[PDB]
Subunit: 480 residues, 4 copies
């Protein structure tokens, strides 16, 4: 049994009536409870994420099955049985908060690992590749996919114009327009690091690594017609599903695998191993099991924990480092940059974002300083032995630079179509039909020249792929 109070701690006498001139008169300015209560209501909302605005979160645990110490010194991977707390957010990409979870889109798969050497964020998607290979293009890509800036409705003519003129998108689109473009929910879904990263071991040796999450629940996808039927009755079915699984004790889980590749394999491959439009052959670079993540606890407050959660690919830990991937390189900047705006300069103090590991440094102040700071010394070097100091046992590697000059230049061996053809051919006949069906419904109303260029990009990937699409769209491509 508790009092309603103001934010000043004064108990509230009447939470029903405003203060007025008699029982039915106009309202007085001297009503601190009314003004405080409205003013805070008036300030509840903060900016949604610029992409991935729609999402849901859960906590759980990651457990190591096979220590990875031969390949990385990462502390959270050092020993069999080692357990690390995680927070995870899943999401769509393009549409705003409140938008349906039945739309075609990659799905976000962002994992925060609270390790003893700092927080490690692996900010993944379900699908293992991406549309583009340079971050400079990201606002363009996003602008083309987002609702039209005049009508506020997504328009295939706009994103197909971009994608067709950005032929490195061809492999991505060959995945996205399979039925795996609409996962059934967040649990029955793949996860992927997408980028090549660098793993560095106790001897300073480096390997390239890729990450894969495989669902215990299996993968399940929705046809366009199954997606429509769900959309009719529930625009939030994936959010609902994730919460409910966990509430009922049916905890979803994923096994983590890696692929590893020596740095020297660059010069022999017919693609760039740090091109995020590429996968690595599972025959040549087999999946190796690392451990299992199980999600087992819903957050206590959606806004405080899921909405305010902040992940960044640049939250790396010793033993794990960026690759040269130019898409990745831009992300290192963009996430903490956007988060300082979306959440405040001190967003890293918000509880879900805090490390378990100790934080000590000489940063200070900023909007909403809540942490009770003390001390006279906020600079280094200083004469005081007890104040925080650098620690040379934790230095990153020093990657070798193969280039001679500061350049703006596409990577060599872009190879935009080959893997797209390999993927196409790996599909079963039923999967190939769904792909063509999905592509056709998306392309049928797009401007003719762009329609043709899309067909030609897919034709370059595989002649049967492109021909089928052309036949299904009524386009005669015999002159070419």
């Amino acid at each position: 049994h508790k009092n309603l109070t103001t934010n000043q701690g004064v108990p509230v006498g009447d939470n029903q009536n405003s203060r007025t001139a008699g029982h039915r008169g106009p309202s007085f300015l001297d009503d601190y409870h009314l003004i405080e209560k409205l003013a805070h209501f008036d300030r509840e909302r903060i900016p949604e994420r610029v992409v991935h605005a729609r999402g849901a979160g859960a906590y759980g645990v990651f457990e190591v099955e096979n220590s990875m110490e031969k390949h990385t010194r990462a502390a959270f991977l050092s020993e069999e049985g080692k357990q690390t707390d995680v927070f995870v957010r899943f999401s769509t990409v393009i549409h705003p908060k409140g938008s349906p979870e039945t739309l075609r889109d990659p799905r976000g798969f962002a994992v925060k690992f609270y390790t003893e050497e700092g927080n490690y964020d692996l900010v993944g998607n379900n699908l293992p590749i991406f549309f583009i290979r340079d971050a400079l293009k990201f606002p363009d890509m996003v602008h083309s996919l987002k609702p039209d800036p005049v009508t506020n409705i997504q328009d295939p003519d706009r994103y197909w114009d971009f994608m067709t003129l950005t032929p490195e998108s061809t492999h991505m689109l060959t995945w996205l327009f399979s039925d795996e473009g609409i996962p059934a929910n967040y649990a029955e879904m793949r996860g992927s690091g997408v980028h090549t990263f660098r793993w560095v071991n106790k001897y300073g040796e480096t390997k390239y690594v890729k990450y894969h999450w495989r669902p215990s629940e299996g993968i399940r996808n929705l046809s366009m017609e199954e997606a429509a039927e769900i959309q009719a009755n529930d625009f939030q079915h994936a959010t609902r599903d994730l919460y409910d699984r966990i509430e009922k004790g049916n905890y979803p889980a994923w096994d983590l695998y890696v692929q590893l590749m020596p740095l020297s394999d660059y010069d022999e491959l017919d693609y760039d191993p740090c091109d995020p439009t590429k996968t690595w052959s599972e025959e040549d670079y087999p999946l190796q099991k690392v451990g299992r993540m199980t999600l087992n606890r819903n957050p206590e407050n959606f806004f405080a924990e899921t909405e305010q959660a902040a992940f960044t690919p640049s939250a790396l830990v010793p033993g794990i480092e960026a690759s040269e991937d130019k898409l990745l390189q831009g992300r290192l900047f963009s996430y903490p940059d956007t988060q300082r705006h979306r959440l405040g300069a001190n967003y890293m103090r918000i509880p879900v974002n805090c490390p378990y590991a100790p934080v000590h440094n000489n940063q200070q102040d900023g909007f909403m300083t809540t942490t009770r700071p003390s001390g006279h010394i906020n600079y280094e070097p200083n004469r005081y032995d007890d104040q925080p100091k650098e620690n040379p046992h934790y230095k990153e590697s020093e990657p070798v630079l193969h280039g001679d000059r500061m350049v703006r230049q596409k990577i060599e061996k872009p190879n935009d179509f080959k893997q797209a053809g390999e993927k196409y051919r790996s599909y079963s006949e039923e999967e190939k039909q769904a792909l063509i069906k999905n592509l056709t419904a998306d392309l049928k109303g797009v401007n003719e020249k762009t329609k043709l260029l899309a067909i030609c990009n897919f034709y370059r990937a595989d002649e049967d792929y492109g021909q089928r699409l052309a036949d299904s769209l009524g386009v005669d491509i015999r002159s070419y």
Copy 2:
């Protein structure tokens, strides 16, 4: 034929590639175009409206048919044929930005008139009454209706708990759970001022006024089943419809009517004429035609114009004033208050929000001062005749206060159930069945005590209304 530039006006050499160490190396910090482009993309989003987040805008014109100078000195209403430019936003209420337009909700109907004596905002809804009668309850009402703060899903058990314990809601719920709770689109839809306002003529004489918008396209609604079938294929059908009507020249329009009531009618009535849970009888207070509003122009940019548009019931013009309605009194504060947070201290300089009438005053500075201010004099009184001065020809009326103490107290004659019964009985048999159907689908899963109290509130409105709902829900109300 134009150059791409930076925001500093420097032409861009390469909008495709980041600046790197050779063609495949890591990225350099000295890439102003990359950082500027990403940093602005990272800051595109602002907070959505705390309610009515989903919506769509258009411009048009209002034309007077019958001059209203006998009852109000309002300049825009002074002459037959007088035309005033408007901007209008329509909206849903509860769910966020990308949410479907097929959900049950009141619809917002906000009209900004750009008059020669200032901007006049009539911030209406389709339905003519409201759930509550005091602004102190608005955050509670909203919190109950919004998605649950843990699960992020709306829960009828939550809002029914609030509404049943707020029996003044009974009239509103009787409208909202008719099929008018889901308008077919924004054109085929009623509009209402909801509140009683005061009209004051040039002699200082005051009348109570209510506003009504009647659609030229007629009113049309969706059953739950028709709403689902639309939802399956389009989660923005009403946004689409409004744009498309206007693009194809099929301009939607609404006629404006008023009702007028002498102040002295207060004692003649068994309810409070400034209680926004109440309508006025059209027999006793007939609709009088004022004019017609036609919407004929889509905005050029949805974010700059529709998203950033700011309406407030406190944007009143000479001749038009607030009533004592306690719900209204809170709104006078809340709208500019939230807008200063949502849009900035200087939101009134954003183009859609700017008046056509001249603005001159002594306010200054604030975030994003873009208006090229000049002059040494930013205070009044001052000794300079050419500086802006108050003008005593534009004073508001001085309403009489009947109460003699500052109190927090419910209005006399709340009369929470009578008009709800009158509405119920005014429904056709088919409308009554839809109401009971809609209510039953919403109530069938809520907690048993709350379910019973709902039935009792509707029973107090009308015995048949309540009995039908009880029978349909399998609740035995014979002991009461």
Copy 3:
């Protein structure tokens, strides 16, 4: 012995060198430590207070000597010997952060009492009256006093134009241009509540109250010449003095007195007892001792505690209420309003601003939500007995309204000049000469018409006062 870390908790290997292409090349974007550190440095600053920007804070304790339960139910005043923690900020008014503490100005004297029934802020100044009597004028007054908006330099011509046309300022200026317009420091300085407030006892009986703080160190002032000599060497001497006193154990203190006046004394006085340009006679309404406040602890961090401190006159507690004073009435709004902009929606969770008393309500979210909220119920009324509820034992009084219309109208008996004459005549001859000296150095350069009006205002206060000022300025007052 501690590691320097990133905000993610990763130890820092090198806090001296940026990451670069060889030992002397350009810098890489993949340097999370560099970018995090700079980005947080780039965001250290928040807006300064719109007035009273320069100031200093300390903590201490207030101890009751005479219990006040006969006149107020205020819990912190209920018993002899009862101790309440305080936080206090002292300040100048007009110039920005960083400005000298040797300038002429009122001094702020803001006391936050952390009481068992909520925080009580008494937001005072040293001087016991104010320039103006209506909050609508405050931005005008402040704009006139502040540096000129073109030159960034304060201009006596500007504020004397305002003040002369605002003759209710005459009493204030007669205090401010004594040498008490430059206190020697914050310890040897008066405090005042300025406004009349209402004290309400357990029986519901109300008295008017005024507050006075009397320094144990005595009151001491600086002549213009003594101020200049200090200014030459120290532009923060008062901040320095306060800190150093407390560090050396020489704790400054003030005794609190009140005056009490029956409500019925309105009608027989020749001024309005709620006009903040007026004092109450100490002969007719004697000072009654309440207790002593001692300041004994410096804050641990100036930004987190003093810069972010938030006081409002509307932070009232049961037994202490606003008066009708129209200056006060505007302050009730303005302080929490500016603080939400200056500090954030959730400024009340910043540690110095937190109550000791429990806080429970249904407000939620907002920028920087750090309080780990939980629970499904964020609305009232609700069906749960354990959730926070209103408590009717804590209702404010219901002041009687004498007026019967909503009006914009000056108070009756403004009496602008009488107390200014009484003050003048209460000065010793030496104090009178300092006043005329101080006034003359301020007025000598202002425009001739405004100069004359100032003389006339002070002449209306007292003929000798005005004649002396005229003589000293070389102004011929014979025509008038």
Copy 4:
């Protein structure tokens, strides 16, 4: 003759009285004019600059005397007689907005050139070198200099601790503790680019460049005692002086010179030519005259134009590029970064920050979008020939990279003391005495070990320099 209005354009009836219950009653909430006016007053302030908060601005014109086309393609320098509008802000560094202009500090000298190929900012200081050579140290350096985070008072013990442990500071301190550490005002003052930059001509040939501004009014400095006497009577004398010069038609001016150095001179030198702790010999690299800048117009509004002005060393134009200077490299990021926070995402639309050159790109939205955007196409590549495209005639150079790994490593040939000795010996005997006097008054109270290390750093620069300082401080340095 004009009306006072609200921001809605409604004329104001009464700018003197709040709306109240009778002439002496409490205030009503329905007073839009009061609430709008107070609310905007409450939001006037934005964050001050994190450094250089105190400053003053003026506009003028730069005129080329000698065309520089042989060394740079910069358009504003291409022809004799070519005139370019400038905006210039001068400043102190460490203390806040209202702080005195008589304090020891470098002075900022920031020039914005509104060129036909974009805005070019040359963000200089009076003194030609800096304390540090890597941006990673800047927040440390600044934290040490700034008022103590507990006391709010600057403490020489704190910055001398940092500086003595950062011996690269030794040259800077040898300038700063001459009397040129307190310029007499902003007109009689040097300007410097500080960094080496790269100039690139139309053939792609690169030279290193340094910039120097020489005042037509000559250089004048203040002794500590002269600075104290001015401080006593005016804490804004330099802001006053600049305005007054320009108001009286006495326009200050500076001639611009450069030094040029071939890239191949790197091996010829015993220091790194891109180390900002170093100058270049005027004998070996003579000053070459470019043109003259005259300041001739005060701004119209100090807040709108000076306070909201935004400069960045990264606002470069074709023909002018960064060097590899690691201090510079951090600055490229930090200025726009801080500005987005201080001013808003759209700060580049604030009138003073706008280019004269056309701006066309695909960025959109952000807080306070006032630019009336239109169009469906906000992405590139796109199929439309009329939309903005990259232009390959405006590419930056491609500087050669000498290093072959990503490293964190001090430059070779830091040479921390030699130029400090050369500067010392260049002083006249009177200048040497003022240096020692100034140093002694700053050092006499710092901790003994730090005091000794300072003496040793200056001794390493020049034995006489260090001996004199030691004698003056009573420190016996026999034993070293």
